[PDB]
Each structure stands twice: as C-alpha cells, then as structure tokens.
C-alpha cells in the first residue's frame, strides 16, 4: 500500500 505520511509508498497495514 501507500504510506501518505510520506510521499512515498511503503506497505502501510492499514
């Protein structure tokens, strides 16, 4: 997934 703390996508397990 994306991370939309950053601008970058990291696997965020939401």
């Given at each position: ?10 696997l965020?397990?939401?």
């Amino acid at each position: 997934e994306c991370c939309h703390r950053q601008l970058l996508c990291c696997l965020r397990f939401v």
